[PDB]
Amino acid sequence: RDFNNLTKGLCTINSWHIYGKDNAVRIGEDSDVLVTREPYVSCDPDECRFYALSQGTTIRGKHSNGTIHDRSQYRALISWPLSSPPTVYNSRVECIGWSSTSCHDGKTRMSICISGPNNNASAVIWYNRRPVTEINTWARNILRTQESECVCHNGVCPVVFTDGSATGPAETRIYYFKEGKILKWEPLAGTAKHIEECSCYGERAEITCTCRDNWQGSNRPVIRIDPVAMTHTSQYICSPVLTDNPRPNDPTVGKCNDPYPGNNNNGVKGFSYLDGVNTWLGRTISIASRSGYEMLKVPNALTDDKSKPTQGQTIVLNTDWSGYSGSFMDYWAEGECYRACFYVELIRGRPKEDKVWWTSNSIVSMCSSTEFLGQWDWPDGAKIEYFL
Amino acid sequence: RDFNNLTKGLCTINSWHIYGKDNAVRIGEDSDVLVTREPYVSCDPDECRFYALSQGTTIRGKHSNGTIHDRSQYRALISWPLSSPPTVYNSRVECIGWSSTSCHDGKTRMSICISGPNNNASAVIWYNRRPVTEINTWARNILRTQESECVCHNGVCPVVFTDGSATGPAETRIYYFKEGKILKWEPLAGTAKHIEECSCYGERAEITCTCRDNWQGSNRPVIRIDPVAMTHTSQYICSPVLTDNPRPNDPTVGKCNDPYPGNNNNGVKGFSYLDGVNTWLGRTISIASRSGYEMLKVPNALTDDKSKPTQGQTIVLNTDWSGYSGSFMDYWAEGECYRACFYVELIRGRPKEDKVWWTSNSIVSMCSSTEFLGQWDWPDGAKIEYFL
Amino acid sequence: RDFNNLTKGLCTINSWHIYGKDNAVRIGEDSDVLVTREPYVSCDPDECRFYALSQGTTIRGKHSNGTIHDRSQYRALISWPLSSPPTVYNSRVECIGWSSTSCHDGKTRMSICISGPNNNASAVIWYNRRPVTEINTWARNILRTQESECVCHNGVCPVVFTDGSATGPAETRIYYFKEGKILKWEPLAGTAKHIEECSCYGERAEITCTCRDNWQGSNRPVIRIDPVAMTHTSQYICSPVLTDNPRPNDPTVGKCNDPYPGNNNNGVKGFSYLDGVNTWLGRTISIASRSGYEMLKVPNALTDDKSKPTQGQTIVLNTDWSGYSGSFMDYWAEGECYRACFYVELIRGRPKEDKVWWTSNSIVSMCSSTEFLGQWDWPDGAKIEYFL
Amino acid sequence: RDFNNLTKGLCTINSWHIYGKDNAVRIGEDSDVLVTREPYVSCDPDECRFYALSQGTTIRGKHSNGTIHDRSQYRALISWPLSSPPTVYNSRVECIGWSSTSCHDGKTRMSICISGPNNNASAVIWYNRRPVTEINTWARNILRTQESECVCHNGVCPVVFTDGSATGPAETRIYYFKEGKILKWEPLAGTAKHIEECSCYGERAEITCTCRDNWQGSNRPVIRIDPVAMTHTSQYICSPVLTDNPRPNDPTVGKCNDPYPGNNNNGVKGFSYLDGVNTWLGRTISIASRSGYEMLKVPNALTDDKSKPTQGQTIVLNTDWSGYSGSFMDYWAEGECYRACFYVELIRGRPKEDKVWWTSNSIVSMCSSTEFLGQWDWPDGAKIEYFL
Ligand SMILES: *[C@@H]1O[C@H](CO)[C@@H](O[C@@H]2O[C@H](CO)[C@@H](O[C@@H]3O[C@H](CO[C@H]4O[C@H](CO)[C@@H](O)[C@H](O)[C@@H]4O)[C@@H](O)[C@H](O[C@H]4O[C@H](CO)[C@@H](O)[C@H](O)[C@@H]4O[C@H]4O[C@H](CO)[C@@H](O)[C@H](O)[C@@H]4O[C@H]4O[C@H](CO)[C@@H](O)[C@H](O)[C@@H]4O)[C@@H]3O)[C@H](O)[C@H]2NC(C)=O)[C@H](O)[C@H]1NC(C)=O
Ligand SMILES: *[C@@H]1O[C@H](CO)[C@@H](O[C@@H]2O[C@H](CO)[C@@H](O[C@@H]3O[C@H](CO[C@H]4O[C@H](CO)[C@@H](O)[C@H](O)[C@@H]4O)[C@@H](O)[C@H](O[C@H]4O[C@H](CO)[C@@H](O)[C@H](O)[C@@H]4O[C@H]4O[C@H](CO)[C@@H](O)[C@H](O)[C@@H]4O[C@H]4O[C@H](CO)[C@@H](O)[C@H](O)[C@@H]4O)[C@@H]3O)[C@H](O)[C@H]2NC(C)=O)[C@H](O)[C@H]1NC(C)=O
Ligand SMILES: *[C@@H]1O[C@H](CO)[C@@H](O[C@@H]2O[C@H](CO)[C@@H](O[C@@H]3O[C@H](CO[C@H]4O[C@H](CO)[C@@H](O)[C@H](O)[C@@H]4O)[C@@H](O)[C@H](O[C@H]4O[C@H](CO)[C@@H](O)[C@H](O)[C@@H]4O[C@H]4O[C@H](CO)[C@@H](O)[C@H](O)[C@@H]4O[C@H]4O[C@H](CO)[C@@H](O)[C@H](O)[C@@H]4O)[C@@H]3O)[C@H](O)[C@H]2NC(C)=O)[C@H](O)[C@H]1NC(C)=O
Ligand SMILES: *[C@@H]1O[C@H](CO)[C@@H](O[C@@H]2O[C@H](CO)[C@@H](O[C@@H]3O[C@H](CO[C@H]4O[C@H](CO)[C@@H](O)[C@H](O)[C@@H]4O)[C@@H](O)[C@H](O[C@H]4O[C@H](CO)[C@@H](O)[C@H](O)[C@@H]4O[C@H]4O[C@H](CO)[C@@H](O)[C@H](O)[C@@H]4O[C@H]4O[C@H](CO)[C@@H](O)[C@H](O)[C@@H]4O)[C@@H]3O)[C@H](O)[C@H]2NC(C)=O)[C@H](O)[C@H]1NC(C)=O
Ligand SMILES: *[C@@H]1O[C@H](CO)[C@@H](O[C@@H]2O[C@H](CO)[C@@H](O)[C@H](O)[C@H]2NC(C)=O)[C@H](O)[C@H]1NC(C)=O
Ligand SMILES: *[C@@H]1O[C@H](CO)[C@@H](O[C@@H]2O[C@H](CO)[C@@H](O)[C@H](O)[C@H]2NC(C)=O)[C@H](O)[C@H]1NC(C)=O
Ligand SMILES: CC(=O)N[C@H]1[C@H]([C@H](O)[C@H](O)CO)OC(C(=O)O)=C[C@@H]1N
Ligand SMILES: CC(=O)N[C@H]1[C@H]([C@H](O)[C@H](O)CO)OC(C(=O)O)=C[C@@H]1N
Ligand SMILES: CC(=O)N[C@H]1[C@H]([C@H](O)[C@H](O)CO)OC(C(=O)O)=C[C@@H]1N
Ligand SMILES: CC(=O)N[C@H]1[C@H]([C@H](O)[C@H](O)CO)OC(C(=O)O)=C[C@@H]1N
Ligand SMILES: *[C@@H]1O[C@H](CO)[C@@H](O)[C@H](O)[C@H]1NC(C)=O
Ligand SMILES: [Ca+2]
Ligand SMILES: [Ca+2]
Ligand SMILES: [Ca+2]
Ligand SMILES: [Ca+2]
Ligand SMILES: [Ca+2]
């Protein structure tokens, strides 16, 4: 109908309720489920669906051998019905590639997939399921993007891309698209020193993205975008509650405009909701590996370099595998506010479970509740031994 | 369009005709059919579908081992096309959880799923396929609900919940929802001493629910709800024709306001249609186990403590496994009356058939006919030996 | 929109072109294809689909053992997309039973399924995918119907049923339905001595049905129905070109009002298009078994007791298995005439191929052309040895 | 709505971006994927889909043995969602046959399938998913058509057919269809000496088809059609950059009105975009076999007998199997120009890989970009050894 506008603020997050779970790895042990990774969730005005990068083979298939690898010509962004697993028969291909983002602007959906060799990748921007614009690699070193949904406001859908080193300065750009066409792009500004895989959401005409500083930061960089002025700023979450992984132990004071040191050249896609006292941070429980997952209420985390938790909720036990996590919201729901949601990728197989030759995942997803709900843990649930 | 109103009375039940059957266990021996239990049927204005709690694995899958268990993080309420089996590829997830109810109000559908550990469960109420309201456990002891469809009248859809002991007094509440929001709730009143898994239907602006007194009753408790006044009453079916299971043999006089003694701490979800002489009771043939199933016409069963059968119809032979049963009707059919329908869950596997490591079921469903139709029996039809 | 009226006459049949083929048995050797038999084809105003009686198991499934049997509680009328095979995932259940018919009246579809034990069967008539009317067995001996589509005119859809002996006089009735309700029924009249499985079509406000005289006739009985007056007549095809099976060799003169003798208590569902010189008869090539299939142009076959072929077309070689055949037409196609079509059931497995424990089939379907097209043969195509 | 008119010219082709890829053979190693060959892509106003000739069996199925054969009664034109593989459950049958073409005229789709024995084949023309016209073989020697989409202009959809020898003069006809009916047909004219499998596209009210001269030409014949006047011309691509296969090495000067000699009685379906300097030719890299695939910009290739490449892009490495290739465009996309697209059939199995008993393929597809995008190679990706 009309372009969606970010007119509401976030609902008060007092806890998290279960939203979706596909149990993909459990089910795929004996059904035609595609091997995936880098999943996310994204809503259309009349439907919310799961998204991921397929590896172009089923989990039980012999071609599952080697799926720990990230970029092959057999990957594609696929989407499928909420909480169903990504099967050969119910998965819809949005575009071909090994890095992606996607979002609905209220009228139709824009999907972006990047493909190609490391030194010659290109992004193809799809709108209304048709290819509209293409962008060639500018730094010739793995052009890559969010791996979770973008956000739109009055037709303008900003997207964060990075091209260049994963272990030193890179070239990050913020592109402002409208109907799949480039309105404007700008180089990253602010104090964030390295940017990868931004997790974004919008409220009251502003888009907030929590990203990954792969190079040096154990705290997470934050990009705030004005989609009307088509400008942005960047900084780090000030709070000493560190949310990347691996990471050093939590200090008593964090860093606002520089990466918090201790771990270099590594990380994990993550997210946060930065809204004053209504601030919640997600993170793996383990500081060493993609193990466990918890939500922590950290009032003013973004601006308070001494902020610590006041409430929390465990999502995945430290005795279970987690992985990527990101933000999304149903911008077309009823009510006076946007209900914060997130998903956690539950990685199974390599490298942590190397008795199998594949690497895949399942998805668990939650949204906020104004109630103070009891908590449960949500593991992938598959028994690797069954696959041996 | 407009909210449905219960303006018609029940059609005269002179017999039962076959409505649906999915032969899920037979088919799933060699196709990707999900393991389920606690099924039911529910209609939308333009379609009627089967519903159940998936176990998040196929029957032939190795993860089917252990599906006798009731509450895991891998369960979800799913729905699929009438008489088709619940497959990985045709099952639509309504919400995540291990106890549920669902009903269409004429405009859209409300679905409720409860999840969590025994002492910290929560219900999430979905409306128009979006999460709208959440309710935390109030007694911290397996918050649970109907396991069959709810019923709506002018937008108000009452739902019966129980939290607390299964072997002593518990805390039952009747929630009145409208568009997924809580209008009102009240604690159970009347003479019913324990309430679980209510099976409901509506006619002439009144909703009748036949439930399960797990604690002490072999006769079934009944809750009658006024969805306009949002009030209710409760009692037991007076008739000496006992319908829970296990149960003692039938006496010559029943109990109207107290559980009929003989069997404690056990039961099975069941149902009835209480309409004067047009009263029909469903029950397992066996008084000891979930074996066989029959419909018995027992005029004034609800109010006559000496009422006995005047007609009957066998649905499943005592030599075949049955299980849960419940009520539903197509409130959007043509005609001057609502045609009473019901389903019977045909449980296969554990605990009765322990040569296999799983527990699942198939569904058989019937609706009333004004004719006096010949009867047939309707077994699950699978050969367990094939699964060995 | 509006009820369809049989306002056109048949197009001139100069040959037959391939319309549909599902290769179900070939494909099902390695995919989840349901075991079926008694198939047919039927059109809706916007789609034509394949129909059949499922056996409630896949062909490769262990429950395929024994599917030679006709009436079990695991059968159902299913429909699926034209030329696709009937799979677990794409088959839509129309109703439960082991004998059926179905037809669209222009507004919506009526489907009829009969189920039950031999002495207590009942038909349930569905309209707009809801059960509307039920008819109890009147002769208590396998109530049964067409096994191919019915035909409608201004809302009135006549259907031929038989109840009673398959080897002596039986009780045949013609029911006139409108919106699933019974307008009228009448007992069979005319000279046809036994009636089973009528294959019907309509043109110029008249419905012609070619049926099966199981008791004594090797020539086929014919019922012509006036759906406005709701009356009919019956006789036999006069032509000496005999079309039932098994049957004696062709004589030089046939019988118009009595069964042509030579073979008793057996037959096969078949069809014909009786339109003056534009008359075409279908039949198995073998006079002994359901082997091969051919179309023969026999001018005035219905009324000329000496009529012989003037043209022909082979559909299935005598070295290949055939089976049931029946008529259907797309009453909603463009043009000035109705294009005659038919399907042939290609039975595989028992009893002819007993190395396998199952019985199933695939479908081949043709429609007429005003051209004189070259002919090909259309076998099922599966290799039984592959199933061993 | 209204018939589509070819009102736009081609967009400037500066490179090719990835459009679709189904990885069918990889996925089908462990899922129910149909064996196919002769694929293509074609758009409807609201969707673009993959098309191919199924072999009526899955790849893992035992009936895959022998699928190197071209014309059996088990083949059919099927279509399925873009970039999904052709599975038993998602493939829609358009018609039955072993040679086809299909195209949308803006209102609805016309599909054509030819079937029958070599000396008695016939084409059936479907419109709006209904059979409308039939054409009998005129030369009684494998009536055959494009194997890629046709193109329409104001309702007129020309189609090129050939009947007769593959190794000497044959009888080629251009049929002009409108709503599935024959408006006119004409015999091939011009200097093209043999015509097979034309690959066509339209722009500015003209349809250009690049075909295959199986008899003698290593350069490709070209048919240009005026769909309004319903007339055409034919010639050969003048350029010395030869594009059929097998073929002799590239000379310095080609032939404009005669086949370039060196290879007889063989070839491969191919295509080109002939638009002045914006001219791009597709071809296998190998001159001996269907190995590799590249796009070459050859300004004025059609008219310049000395034209050589000025730019290029590799699509499939010479170390990987290719096969058929053809043109298609989304005539309903936004913008001021038509974006040239093509697909390449990646054949796997026999005859090149004879360790397996089958022959199948997967699809890769690209469209043009006005950018100068980095290139990647796109192999089928399956490991034959896995199928052993
Ligand atoms: C039924 O359900 C309800 C609803 O969920 C359950 O109630 C919930 O219970 C939760 C567990 O107790 C609780 O979550 C905790 O909340 C704490 C905050 O609340 C407390 O502090 C405030 C502040 O003054 C008070 O107002 C409040 O009353 C409480 O006292 C958090 O601080 C907790 O998080 C910390 O602990 C967990 C371990 O439990 C860690 O995993 C987590 O990361 C936090 O601790 C680390 O980080 C801090 C910050 O830097 C450090 O100070 C600390 O040392 C830890 O650091 C190590 O570990 C991290 C992670 O590995 C590593 O990076 C670092 O380097 C160090 O090694 C926790 O979030 C919910 O708030 C509560 N909800 C409600 C509504 O009450 C109820 O129990 C359930 N019922 C039953 C019967 O089970
Ligand atoms: C073709 O199809 C038609 C249509 O279905 C077939 O006709 C049907 O036939 C059915 C079987 O005969 C019949 O069903 C029975 O109806 C009886 C009621 O009708 C009779 O009584 C009235 C009352 O005066 C008369 O008007 C009427 O004319 C009849 O005489 C029921 O009473 C029957 O139910 C009881 O029996 C069955 C066993 O058959 C039990 O399973 C059932 O639970 C009932 O009996 C138990 O319960 C009562 C009540 O407390 C006790 O008194 C009794 O002792 C039993 O108790 C034991 O068992 C239970 C269950 O295990 C346990 O809990 C308890 O503790 C005790 O151990 C039965 O329902 C249909 O009405 C009839 N329909 C029609 C339209 O005619 C026809 O036969 C078919 N044709 C062929 C050729 O097959
Ligand atoms: C390319 O394609 C075209 C298009 O299809 C091919 O041309 C077609 O060729 C067909 C085969 O020749 C032909 O079909 C035959 O037509 C005959 C009728 O035409 C002839 O007679 C008339 C009458 O005067 C002439 O006008 C006309 O010119 C012809 O001469 C039919 O009579 C044929 O059917 C009979 O033969 C077949 C065997 O081929 C039987 O299976 C069939 O049942 C018919 O014969 C039985 O029945 C009759 C009637 O009672 C008996 O008299 C006879 O003895 C047989 O009885 C035995 O067998 C039956 C069945 O088993 C059993 O029940 C009984 O008891 C006995 O045992 C046949 O239909 C098409 O018309 C023709 N089409 C066109 C447009 O030309 C062309 O060949 C192809 N090209 C190539 C190169 O292959
Ligand atoms: C990142 O991505 C970009 C974008 O893709 C990459 O840049 C691309 O690089 C490509 C490879 O270098 C390049 O493709 C080539 O372009 C040549 C044309 O450009 C050149 O010539 C013009 C003309 O004066 C100049 O303006 C221009 O500056 C260049 O110098 C083509 O000629 C090339 O094709 C020929 O070579 C390939 C082998 O590489 C053959 O496979 C192909 O068939 C062509 O050669 C055959 O045919 C000709 C014509 O008859 C014969 O003369 C020749 O001998 C060959 O004949 C043999 O082989 C054929 C085929 O087997 C056989 O039939 C025959 O009989 C003989 O045996 C080639 O197309 C892109 O244009 C370029 N794109 C851009 C935008 O720059 C960049 O490299 C990537 N970056 C990295 C770091 O990898
Ligand atoms: C989001 O905000 C913009 C207003 O800036 C709205 O876009 C007006 O919408 C109407 C209805 O289609 C048009 O007549 C105006 O020209 C629109 N655009 C502008 C840029 O002024 C848009 O309607 C809002 N979205 C929603 C859902 O209300
Ligand atoms: C089939 O024939 C009957 C006419 O007997 C048509 O039914 C008239 O249709 C209009 C349009 O809905 C109504 O106003 C009349 O009352 C209809 N019925 C009768 C019984 O008179 C019907 O329209 C015809 N079907 C088609 C497709 O034309
Ligand atoms: C485009 C690409 O390959 N992205 C990969 C990502 C990057 O390798 C990482 O962010 C460093 O640049 O890492 C991870 C990862 O699991 O850490 C997965 C992504 N597939
Ligand atoms: C929420 C829950 O676990 N409900 C279970 C139910 C209860 O255990 C029973 O009603 C006693 O409370 O029993 C049964 C049962 O088969 O008896 C199945 C239900 N899964
Ligand atoms: C209802 C029923 O069982 N109909 C069967 C039919 C009858 O047995 C036959 O027409 C005699 O009555 O025969 C055949 C048959 O193959 O001859 C199949 C049908 N399933
Ligand atoms: C109708 C038909 O059989 N067409 C076939 C085609 C022809 O054999 C070829 O064009 C020569 O006529 O060749 C090829 C081929 O791979 O070369 C495939 C087609 N199936
Ligand atoms: C099929 O069933 C028969 C009868 O029960 C049995 O003797 C036979 O061995 C079975 N065949 C298979 C393959 O199970
Ligand atoms: Ca980091
Ligand atoms: Ca399988
Ligand atoms: Ca009880
Ligand atoms: Ca007979
Ligand atoms: Ca050639």
| Cα three-residue angle A167-A171-A174, rounded to 5 degrees | 130
For residue D166, the CA-to-ligand 10 centroid distance in Å is 9
Nearest ligand 10 atom to the CA of D114 is 1
Quick one: DSSP state of residue C267? -
Nearest ligand 8 atom to the CA of B144 is 1
- A52 — phi, psi (to 5°)? -175, 170
- Residue A116's identity, in one-letter code, is G
Q: Is A29 helix (H, G, I), strand (E, B) or coil?
A: helix
| CA nearest to D239, candidates D264, D220, D216 | D220
Active site residue A324: yes
Quick one: DSSP state of residue A310? S
Partner-chain residue, chosen from B57, B131, B132, that has the shortest CB–CB distance to A26: B57
Which technique was the structure solved with, according to the deposited record? X-ray
Tracing tokens 């006496």 back to the chain, one arrives at: B251
C-alpha dist (Å) from residue D188 to B118, D148, D194, D224, D231: 79, 19, 9, 11, 10
Alpha helices in chain A (DSSP H): 24-27
Task: Give the integer Cα–Cα distance in Å for D122 and D198.
Answer: 19
For residue C4, the CA-to-ligand 13 centroid distance in Å is 43
For residue C331, the CA-to-ligand 6 centroid distance in Å is 16
| Residues B56 and A27 sit within 8 Å (Cβ to Cβ) | yes
Task: For an interface test with C, give the residue of B23, B25, B364 to mutate (most C CBs within 10 A).
Answer: B23
C-alpha dist (Å) from residue D118 to A33, A49, C208: 42, 49, 37
- Residue D111's identity, in one-letter code, is S
The number of angstroms, rounded, from the C-alpha of C207 to the middle of its chain's C-alpha atoms is 14
Counted across chains B and C, CB pairs separated by less than 8 A come out at: 115
Touching subunits for chain B (3+ Cβ pairs under 8 A): A, C
Partner-chain residue, chosen from D57, D124, D135, that has the shortest CB–CB distance to C27: D57
Cβ of B116 within 8 Å of Cβ of A374? The answer is: yes
Residues 6+ apart with CB under 8 A from A354: none
Task: Give the integer Cα–Cα distance in Å for D118 and A303.
Answer: 79
**Which residues sit opposite A235 in a β-bridge?**
A222
Quick one: DSSP state of residue D68? T
Strand spans (E) along C179-248: 181-187, 196-203, 206-212, 221-226, 231-236
Query: CA torsion, points A165, A167, A171, A173, in degrees to nearest 10?
Result: 110
Task: Give the integer Cα–Cα distance in Å for B230 and B152.
Answer: 12
Partner-chain residue, chosen from C33, C89, C369, that has the shortest CB–CB distance to D134: C369
The first and second tokens of residue C291, run together, are 């082997």
Active site residue B70: yes
Domains of chain A: 1-388 (2.120.10.10)
The first and second tokens of residue A193, run together, are 């020193």
Task: Give the integer Cα–Cα distance in Å for A220 and D107.
Answer: 53
Task: Give the integer Cα–Cα distance in Å for C50 and C82.
Answer: 5
Helix (H), strand (E), coil (C) string for chain B: CCCCCCCCEECCCCEEEEEEECCHHHHHHHCCEEEEEEEEEEEECCEEEEEEEEEEEECCCHHHCCCCCCCCCCCEEEEEECCCCCECCCCEEEEECCEEEEEECCCCEEEEEEECCCCCCEEEEEECCEEEEEEECCCCCCCECCCCCCCCECCEEEEEEEEECCCCCEEEEEEEEECCEEEEEEECCCCCCCCEEEEEEEECCEEEEEEECCCCCCCCEEEEEECCCCEEEEEECCCCCCCCCCCCCCCCCCCCCCCCCCCCCCCCCCCEECCCCCCEEEECCCCCCCEEEEEEECCCCCCCCCCCCCEEEEEEEEEEECCCEEEECCCCCCCCEECCEEEEEEEEECCCCCCCCCEEEEEEEEEEECCCCCCCCCCCCCCHHHHC
Task: Give the integer Cα–Cα distance in Å for D224 and D208.
Answer: 5
Cβ of B56 within 8 Å of Cβ of A378? The answer is: no
Buried b or exposed e, range D182-193, using 16+ CB within 10 angstroms: eeebeebebebb
* Nearest alpha carbon, ligand 10 atom 2: D70
Q: How close does chain A come to D368, measured CA to CA in Å? A: 10
Task: Give the integer Cα–Cα distance in Å for C85 and C94.
Answer: 16
- Residue B383's identity, in one-letter code, is K
Cβ of C30 within 8 Å of Cβ of D91? The answer is: no
